[PDB]
Amino acid sequence: NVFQTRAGCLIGAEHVNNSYECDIPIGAGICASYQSQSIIAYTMSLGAENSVAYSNNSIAIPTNFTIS
Amino acid sequence: LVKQLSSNFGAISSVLNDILSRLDKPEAEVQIDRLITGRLQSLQTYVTQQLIRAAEIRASANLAATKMSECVLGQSKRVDFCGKGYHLMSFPQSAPHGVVFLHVTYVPAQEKNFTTAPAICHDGKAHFPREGVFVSNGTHWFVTQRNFYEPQIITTDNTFVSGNCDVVIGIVNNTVYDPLQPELDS
Amino acid sequence: VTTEILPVSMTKTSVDCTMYICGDSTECSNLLLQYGSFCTQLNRALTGIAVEQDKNTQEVFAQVKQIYKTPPIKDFGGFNFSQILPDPSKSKRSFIEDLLFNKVTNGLTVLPPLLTDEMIAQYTSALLAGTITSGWTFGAGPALQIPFAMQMAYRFNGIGVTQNVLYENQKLIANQFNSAIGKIQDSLSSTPSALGKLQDVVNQNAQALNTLVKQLSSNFGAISSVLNDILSRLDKPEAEVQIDRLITGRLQSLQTYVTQQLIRAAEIRASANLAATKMSECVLGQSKRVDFCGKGYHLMSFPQSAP
Amino acid sequence: STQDLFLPFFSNVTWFHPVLPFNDGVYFASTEKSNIIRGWIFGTTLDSKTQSLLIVNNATNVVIKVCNNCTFEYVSFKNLREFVFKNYFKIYSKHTPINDLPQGFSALEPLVDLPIGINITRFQTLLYYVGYLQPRTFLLKYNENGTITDAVDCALDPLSETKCTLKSFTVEKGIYQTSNFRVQPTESIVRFPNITNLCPFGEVFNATRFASVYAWNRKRISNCVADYSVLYNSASFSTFKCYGVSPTKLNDLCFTNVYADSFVIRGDEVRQIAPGQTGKIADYNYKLPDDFTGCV
Ligand SMILES: *[C@@H]1O[C@H](CO)[C@@H](O[C@@H]2O[C@H](CO)[C@@H](O)[C@H](O)[C@H]2NC(C)=O)[C@H](O)[C@H]1NC(C)=O
Ligand SMILES: *[C@@H]1O[C@H](CO)[C@@H](O[C@@H]2O[C@H](CO)[C@@H](O)[C@H](O)[C@H]2NC(C)=O)[C@H](O)[C@H]1NC(C)=O
Ligand SMILES: *[C@@H]1O[C@H](CO)[C@@H](O[C@@H]2O[C@H](CO)[C@@H](O)[C@H](O)[C@H]2NC(C)=O)[C@H](O)[C@H]1NC(C)=O
Ligand SMILES: *[C@@H]1O[C@H](CO)[C@@H](O)[C@H](O)[C@H]1NC(C)=O
Ligand SMILES: *[C@@H]1O[C@H](CO)[C@@H](O)[C@H](O)[C@H]1NC(C)=O
Ligand SMILES: *[C@@H]1O[C@H](CO)[C@@H](O)[C@H](O)[C@H]1NC(C)=O
Ligand SMILES: *[C@@H]1O[C@H](CO)[C@@H](O)[C@H](O)[C@H]1NC(C)=O
């Protein structure tokens, strides 16, 4: 249970292949969090991906609103 | 700062009275000088940190004053200056050592795909929307405002003419209803 | 198409007060214990600086909820963003981001930034794709697509020019835009001094570190700047005095370094707040503030990452 | 936060139901009901020819001795009795009723301070658990009444170092830089060039004609690396002395000029070869400066 990251040696944290919003920042892209439960180290996720359906004659117009 | 009063800085004792009660003048002067050097340096470090921190706080206070002016006393166009969304208004709430703004913003919510065109051919004329966009539900064309789907029918009041059909890229075709023709006919 | 360079973050540094002062020596360390908590608050100050740097970058770039991506078909009404869009082949950086990244060149440790350059590039790609495909709507709510020519017609209305003026001059405007982007490439490629604003930052930190290390080579009045030699030549009653002089000098060198770093980090934070504001009001929307977003009536802005 | 001799948390306390070293301080607990545990001997040999502290808690009175030749004499399993013995001599104690070793926490208010300064390396009990103390930094939580209700052993594990760094007993979520790792040097290296260019004592000591005492010969030795092992390490010489140096320190220091005079003398008058020496060999032939630096 030893993981060599670009920031140094991480001992006692479980490497994971998922990616989440950064909980505890470790550095060089790596975060760690408490999630039976243990401490996991993962490359952070910049956000849920998205792709606007762009095309040269398509427009999206809101039909409702929310006051926030 | 307070803890730095317990450090010898090299003297025989951090307590000044002990040095005074245990030594004559010519030597107590040496020890007390060591203490004075240390404690003076501790004050200077404290004061420097405070100066820098106060500068940061007044930057924050100038920002808060700007938000109060442009954001509470008015309606801001500056994007994300006054919350995420199209700013509507703001309300200031006092908090210990600071302020809390409640930014009321408008967030467009439920959206649809439409087919759109930049202009409209009517009689070899190009019509552009005064304010709004041309949208097509699939079969017919309307003009709507841009931030809330509210289709009106396309008339010579929603649009203005400019040029002709042969220059714009993507122009399409419809009637452009003229409200006054029925009145001239009726 | 004008260019505006803004520093955002410094190098995160940390100094092990005791190695710097008393490097690998116990007599010195026990003499240093007498000075109280100077070392711990030096470390506290530097740590505050480093955390701040990460926050600066987070505020400038992480202003986008999702990661939008440009469609494979690039029919943007005639405009050609290929030189600012990411390069799939290459670190997925754009062409101009590559020019920029090329044109910038004891107890001390350097910490790595929390956001790697790859993630910064993904952020700016996301902002760019969102701007191109959705306009300013993606910064106010959900990204709503709109044909690029029509978005630009909106922006022309924004500066007060009727929108028939774009549709009737679309090819001419697209050509001028493409030409202007090419000139940006050339202006950066040719002269280096353009990036001085960023380069200077690096230089400053480097200088401030060299000086720090060089201060290890001063007596400050002792018989030698070599702690071991003072130790090995003199008897502890006198070695203690000489070492005291050394400790005072080196400790003051650290305090000077840390104060300079704090002031400089205040400068950088001011600049990073400016950059965040420009991102929000200038990339995510269209600005009416005069000369906030370049000389002229502002239409749109394109964010490019740089060291 | 205090740096003192304490009992590292969770350490393996030896259990007995012999003589034990004292290495640097001794915790001593005993779960007792029948009070076989009376007293203590401490010392280095506990046999005579040295001073060995004795303590007896006998049924009304606390005899305490440093014996004859006595230098001092003081006088005064539900029973969990705890004691701490450190070195002058200090004993702390405590006594709780409990119902093996109990989970919980209690401080040990001191009892006695024997200003004796004995040399102790071993000890035995006079008819229980034996722990040893280490130089540890603790973080003690003095309550409102001024009692110690919790402690933190700042080298037990990373969490304890964290808490000690913050000077707190509760840690908010985050990353904290608590210490500095250093790879220690595993060994030492001493390197210098080859050891050639020795001062030629082969001309002074390996000669063939020892000149007159009155006309004694004086040759120079300098600009070399003078071996100092051979002269003082050979047992051939019937006399090797020096008057200004440690003759077992010559293989370190360095000198500007070395002079070597040789002479033949009577064995008896040999003593006259010294700084501050009197006699014909000492005055009329060869006088050594009263502060002469060198060797004979
Ligand atoms: C597309 O637009 C046409 C406008 O002509 C819509 O047709 C009208 O629909 C309403 C309700 O469906 C009827 O009451 C009208 O009589 C229709 N008018 C005509 C001329 O057809 C049509 O509904 C729109 N499409 C959608 C999906 O709403
Ligand atoms: C939109 O409407 C115009 C009507 O003016 C159409 O233009 C005519 O198109 C036909 C065939 O393309 C030509 O023979 C006529 O000479 C055109 N007249 C004019 C005035 O342009 C145009 O084709 C329509 N658009 C589409 C896509 O059908
Ligand atoms: C967008 O601009 C780029 C300029 O870099 C064009 O790329 C050049 O295209 C020509 C012909 O397609 C090639 O001969 C060059 O080698 C290309 N250079 C590079 C650097 O790619 C690109 O073609 C333009 N897009 C369009 C649609 O014309
Ligand atoms: C808009 O959303 C609200 C809920 O937020 C809903 O009650 C209302 O019916 C919606 N309007 C339309 C036209 O769907
Ligand atoms: C518009 O269409 C695209 C694909 O045709 C789809 O991904 C998108 O969700 C649609 N928009 C809405 C609001 O449903
Ligand atoms: C829009 O793109 C489609 C691709 O299917 C193309 O056929 C059409 O001609 C384009 N319209 C314009 C105005 O370029
Ligand atoms: C201190 O001891 C008294 C008993 O005399 C008790 O009333 C009080 O609660 C104690 N204080 C604390 C903080 O436990």
Side-chain angles (χ1 to χ4, degrees), chain A residues 1-5 7-15 17-20 22-68, chain B residues 1-28 30-83 85-124 126-130 132-180 182-183 186, chain C residues 1-23 25-26 28-64 66-89 91 93-102 104-116 119-189 191-234 236-237 239-294 296-307, chain D residues 1-3 5-31 33-48 50-59 62-67 69-75 77-78 80-87 89-99 101-102 104-108 110-123 125-142 144-171 173-181 183-193 195 198-202 204-207 211 215 224 226 235 242 244 247 254 260 267 274-276 279 282 289 294-295:
Chain A
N1 193 359
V2 164
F3 176 33
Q4 174 84 56
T5 74
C9 196
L10 193 49
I11 293 167
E14 185 196 358
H15 185 37
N17 268 354
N18 298 304
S19 52
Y20 312 72
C22 200
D23 196 7
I24 294 151
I26 278 172
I30 308 302
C31 307
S33 78
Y34 189 56
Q35 270 169 247
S36 304
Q37 296 194 280
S38 87
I39 299 188
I40 46 172
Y42 52 90
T43 288
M44 68 159 89
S45 159
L46 302 194
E49 202 184 65
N50 187 289
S51 70
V52 186
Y54 175 86
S55 88
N56 60 4
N57 58 314
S58 166
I59 190 155
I61 285 187
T63 67
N64 212 353
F65 54 79
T66 77
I67 303 315
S68 76
Chain B
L1 196 59
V2 189
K3 298 299 294 297
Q4 289 280 98
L5 283 172
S6 59
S7 313
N8 304 348
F9 298 111
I12 72 178
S13 160
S14 82
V15 182
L16 191 59
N17 295 322
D18 288 26
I19 304 170
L20 282 192
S21 80
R22 286 164 48 180
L23 283 179
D24 44 43
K25 179 175 173 64
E27 294 294 328
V30 166
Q31 306 297 319
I32 294 175
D33 167 63
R34 299 187 73 69
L35 279 189
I36 281 167
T37 288
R39 293 178 177 179
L40 189 58
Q41 169 181 75
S42 311
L43 280 172
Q44 265 158 22
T45 307
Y46 174 69
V47 174
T48 308
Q49 300 298 116
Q50 284 295 285
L51 284 172
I52 293 158
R53 206 170 293 136
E56 169 200 69
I57 291 292
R58 63 175 173 83
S60 189
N62 292 336
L63 180 65
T66 297
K67 278 183 192 280
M68 184 81 66
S69 299
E70 300 176 27
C71 197
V72 176
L73 269 56
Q75 188 197 11
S76 180
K77 294 298 169 298
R78 307 173 52 181
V79 181
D80 295 12
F81 187 54
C82 286
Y86 303 119
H87 181 239
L88 283 177
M89 59 200 301
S90 289
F91 309 112
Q93 292 287 261
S94 69
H97 288 331
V99 69
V100 166
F101 299 92
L102 318 177
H103 301 301
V104 179
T105 55
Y106 170 101
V107 191
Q110 295 169 13
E111 65 183 2
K112 277 173 56 83
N113 285 341
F114 294 97
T115 292
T116 192
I120 289 275
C121 276
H122 180 31
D123 283 306
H127 292 262
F128 303 76
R130 286 201 185 285
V133 292
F134 290 137
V135 291
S136 171
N137 69 350
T139 58
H140 294 83
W141 285 88
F142 308 103
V143 56
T144 179
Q145 48 184 344
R146 306 176 173 162
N147 281 290
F148 186 84
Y149 182 54
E150 180 182 275
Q152 294 82 17
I153 202 61
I154 307 185
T155 67
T156 49
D157 312 325
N158 297 324
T159 77
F160 63 89
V161 178
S162 174
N164 73 348
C165 278
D166 290 304
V167 60
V168 184
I169 288 156
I171 178 164
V172 305
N173 287 339
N174 291 112
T175 318
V176 172
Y177 181 67
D178 181 285
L180 188 153
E183 306 306 329
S186 176
Chain C
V1 175
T2 62
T3 299
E4 169 164 36
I5 295 91
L6 275 151
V8 175
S9 59
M10 302 195 306
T11 301
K12 309 156 71 190
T13 306
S14 164
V15 166
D16 177 17
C17 188
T18 312
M19 293 177 70
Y20 183 78
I21 304 188
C22 284
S25 158
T26 62
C28 189
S29 200
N30 298 120
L31 279 181
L32 178 64
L33 284 180
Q34 283 166 341
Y35 282 72
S37 71
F38 273 134
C39 287
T40 190
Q41 65 169 313
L42 290 181
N43 295 342
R44 203 159 65 213
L46 288 175
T47 297
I49 281 155
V51 164
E52 185 188 308
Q53 302 316 295
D54 283 328
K55 184 173 62 180
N56 290 350
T57 302
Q58 200 82 32
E59 275 165 3
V60 184
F61 289 107
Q63 290 201 10
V64 63
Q66 304 168 299
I67 298 283
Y68 310 90
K69 64 182 182 292
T70 49
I73 306 291
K74 308 293 199 293
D75 51 350
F76 297 131
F79 301 70
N80 180 338
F81 308 104
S82 66
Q83 298 180 342
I84 59 172
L85 280 183
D87 206 354
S89 79
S91 191
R93 272 199 297 259
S94 72
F95 188 80
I96 285 173
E97 287 177 304
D98 264 340
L99 296 174
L100 296 166
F101 269 82
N102 291 341
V104 181
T105 50
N106 48 5
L108 278 60
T109 188
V110 164
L111 299 174
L114 169 65
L115 277 175
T116 69
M119 292 187 286
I120 311 283
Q122 301 188 17
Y123 276 142
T124 68
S125 169
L127 289 158
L128 209 49
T131 308
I132 289 155
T133 57
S134 51
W136 58 78
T137 66
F138 83 109
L144 312 160
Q145 74 261 21
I146 185 168
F148 193 86
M150 284 192 66
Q151 160 183 345
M152 201 84 168
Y154 284 13
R155 309 223 177 206
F156 268 48
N157 268 347
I159 58 154
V161 192
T162 299
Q163 81 201 303
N164 81 54
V165 171
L166 187 152
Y167 295 127
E168 285 162 5
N169 307 303
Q170 191 181 326
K171 283 172 183 165
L172 166 76
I173 297 160
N175 289 344
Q176 306 189 16
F177 169 76
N178 296 318
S179 173
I181 305 282
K183 283 178 216 154
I184 285 302
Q185 266 186 12
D186 301 322
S187 170
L188 292 177
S189 289
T191 177
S193 64
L195 298 187
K197 296 291 300 303
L198 297 175
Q199 178 75 45
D200 165 34
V201 169
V202 181
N203 290 349
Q204 262 158 38
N205 301 327
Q207 296 300 117
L209 274 171
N210 280 324
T211 299
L212 190 65
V213 182
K214 292 273 305 167
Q215 291 295 98
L216 290 171
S217 292
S218 304
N219 312 321
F220 299 107
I223 63 163
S224 187
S225 72
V226 181
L227 187 61
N228 288 318
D229 292 5
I230 280 176
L231 274 169
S232 87
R233 173 205 297 195
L234 295 199
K236 187 174 278 189
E240 274 201 1
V241 170
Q242 305 305 283
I243 287 182
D244 289 329
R245 304 194 59 114
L246 266 188
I247 283 181
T248 295
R250 291 175 172 176
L251 171 60
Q252 185 178 3
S253 291
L254 275 174
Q255 287 171 354
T256 285
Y257 170 77
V258 170
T259 313
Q260 300 291 125
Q261 288 301 118
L262 286 173
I263 289 170
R264 207 169 283 148
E267 280 164 38
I268 283 284
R269 187 184 51 239
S271 158
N273 291 339
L274 182 68
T277 297
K278 273 189 197 270
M279 185 64 73
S280 292
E281 314 191 9
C282 197
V283 178
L284 268 59
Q286 182 186 19
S287 184
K288 298 302 127 187
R289 302 174 56 187
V290 178
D291 291 2
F292 188 54
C293 288
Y297 304 129
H298 176 247
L299 299 167
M300 61 209 50
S301 291
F302 299 128
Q304 294 287 265
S305 74
Chain D
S1 175
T2 174
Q3 205 286 345
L5 278 299
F6 288 97
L7 176 72
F9 280 32
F10 295 75
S11 67
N12 259 330
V13 68
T14 312
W15 180 355
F16 297 89
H17 175 83
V19 186
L20 283 72
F22 202 84
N23 315 73
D24 309 78
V26 163
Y27 174 75
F28 181 101
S30 70
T31 46
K33 180 57 64 176
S34 76
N35 314 308
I36 301 172
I37 296 97
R38 302 313 164 72
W40 280 273
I41 312 102
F42 309 146
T44 57
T45 64
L46 266 55
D47 185 9
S48 294
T50 188
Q51 299 218 36
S52 50
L53 182 164
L54 160 55
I55 280 165
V56 176
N57 204 313
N58 59 343
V62 182
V63 163
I64 296 171
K65 299 204 262 205
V66 190
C67 310
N69 291 319
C70 305
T71 313
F72 178 87
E73 185 176 12
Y74 180 94
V75 189
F77 298 155
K78 297 186 201 141
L80 179 65
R81 295 146 199 287
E82 297 185 346
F83 294 78
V84 183
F85 305 69
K86 55 186 304 303
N87 296 295
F89 191 93
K90 299 184 284 298
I91 190 167
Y92 317 77
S93 72
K94 193 64 172 155
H95 170 226
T96 62
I98 53 150
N99 63 7
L101 199 62
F105 201 93
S106 84
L108 267 60
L111 289 188
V112 194
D113 299 319
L114 283 72
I116 62 170
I118 182 172
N119 195 224
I120 285 174
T121 78
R122 294 178 65 88
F123 88 93
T125 294
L126 281 73
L127 282 72
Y128 75 84
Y129 292 162
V130 166
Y132 293 96
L133 306 183
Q134 303 203 240
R136 294 175 81 91
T137 301
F138 275 41
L139 191 87
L140 294 174
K141 175 169 169 187
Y142 293 90
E144 188 186 357
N145 285 2
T147 79
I148 287 187
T149 76
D150 271 329
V152 161
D153 195 349
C154 301
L156 193 57
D157 58 343
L159 190 57
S160 291
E161 282 196 13
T162 289
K163 294 175 181 158
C164 298
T165 295
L166 312 175
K167 308 285 182 303
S168 160
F169 272 41
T170 180
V171 178
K173 173 183 64 156
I175 189 167
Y176 308 88
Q177 189 274 331
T178 79
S179 177
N180 289 264
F181 176 69
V183 185
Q184 289 313 104
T186 74
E187 47 174 304
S188 288
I189 297 309
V190 165
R191 305 277 274 153
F192 292 108
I195 196 57
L198 279 80
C199 285
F201 286 132
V204 165
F205 290 97
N206 301 97
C224 78
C242 310
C254 198
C295 298

